[PDB]
């Protein structure tokens, strides 16, 4: 139409192409699949994945499209990715699992979803932190409770020798911190 006349023959040929040239659209830091997922473009994510794309490809920091969908709480995209056999067991550059990320961002639906896909709820990163350690750090009683209900082990220690309760003792005396401590001390007793 208008601006199309401003294009060279080579550029017009690109515009009319039936398949994307993804090499142009990609860098080590910004992967088009990751970007589309991170900003919530579900239909476009699905379109890209219908071409020749590694669904498990990593950015310069070792994260996959699943990390990006999870961190941004893009729930439908996260479900879709797993449904399309994205690898749920990927680790980041410090040995943390997707569950660690789902917990940090306080996403109960993703936590549940990851468990259905056989996530180890007690997995430790390089520093020995479990998802429960992260939930405690977040002071999110709702998330802590969910993890406990789903069988998280309160006795797992990080490299400093701290259980999630132990970690709680260092977080600072404050109401939200007390509520988590109470959950941690009381929950095992509610098991018969």
């Amino acid at each position: 139409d208008g601006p199309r006349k401003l294009l060279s023959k080579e550029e017009k040929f690109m515009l009319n192409s039936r398949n994307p040239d993804l090499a142009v659209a990609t860098s080590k830091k910004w992967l088009p699949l990751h970007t589309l997922a991170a900003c919530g473009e579900f239909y476009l994510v699905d379109s890209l994945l219908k071409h020749n794309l590694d669904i498990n490809a990593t950015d310069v920091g070792g994260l996959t499209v699943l990390h990006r969908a999870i961190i941004g709480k893009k729930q439908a995209i996260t479900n879709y990715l797993l449904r399309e056999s994205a690898n749920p067991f990927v680790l980041d550059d410090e040995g943390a699992t997707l569950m660690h990320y789902a917990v940090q961002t306080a996403s109960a639906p993703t936590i549940k979803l990851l468990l259905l896909y056989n996530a180890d709820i007690n997995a430790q990163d390089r520093d020995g932190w479990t998802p429960l350690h992260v939930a405690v750090q977040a002071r999110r009683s709702d998330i802590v409770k969910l993890l406990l209900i789903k069988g998280a082990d309160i006795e797992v220690k990080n490299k400093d020798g701290l259980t999630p309760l132990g970690l709680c003792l260092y977080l600072g005396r404050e109401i939200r911190t007390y509520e988590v401590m109470k959950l941690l001390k009381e929950f095992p007793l509610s098991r018969h």
Partner: protein, 199 residues
């Protein structure tokens, strides 16, 4: 009525072992070294879990609001990556530096564009961020906006001084990113914006 706090504090202490009690009383304020690791920075975690008051407590007790992690990211970077917009605006009002580039040369504006946070983008303009900041590979926010196929954000960057003749390290214009997807990716609309805007 913070008698609830004293009541709750007592309830919890009654549950603790003597050894746990000693540690608790020794740590009225958060113990930074004990509660932080490589992957899990308290400000970042609290930001992503929407714990604004707890963030303020950490900061007011001496933790730098622009404290960086292993990837030179601050809580602001992470809050944006998580698209936690109420936390983002809180941090900015508290004086979080919106100009800082992380390890990959990425600024808050880069990430706000990547997660498609239009309101955060508009807010960053008000703090006079450099909208043409280039990362380690020469990518600007305009490049990422076009990659995300977002017409609104592409347009607003151009209206606010985004440079459409800035090339990545391997010579790509935002125009190239618009064209390369071919049909059915809003490519023509993006090209049109890039050929006409601004003015």
């Amino acid at each position: 009525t913070d008698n609830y706090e004293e009541e709750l504090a007592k309830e919890v202490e009654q549950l603790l072992e003597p050894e746990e009690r000693v540690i608790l009383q020794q740590n009225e304020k958060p113990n930074l070294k004990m509660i932080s690791t490589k992957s899990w920075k308290p400000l970042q975690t609290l930001a992503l879990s929407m714990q604004i008051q707890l963030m303020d407590n950490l900061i007011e007790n001496g933790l730098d609001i622009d404290d960086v992690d292993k990837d030179n990211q601050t809580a602001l970077h992470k809050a944006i990556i998580g698209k936690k917009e109420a936390v983002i605006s809180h941090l900015l009002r508290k004086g979080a530096n919106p100009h800082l580039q992380d390890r990959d040369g990425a600024a808050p504006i880069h990430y706000a564009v990547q997660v498609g946070a239009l309101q955060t983008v508009k807010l960053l303009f008000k703090y006079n961020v450099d909208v043409n900041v280039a990362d380690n590979e020469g990518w600007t926010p305009l490049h990422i906006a076009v990659q995300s196929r977002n017409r609104d954000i592409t347009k607003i960057l151009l209206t606010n001084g985004a440079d459409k003749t800035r090339r990545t390290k391997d010579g790509k214009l935002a125009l190239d990113l618009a064209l390369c997807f071919g049909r059915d990716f809003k490519s023509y609309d993006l090209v049109k914006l890039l050929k006409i805007m601004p003015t």
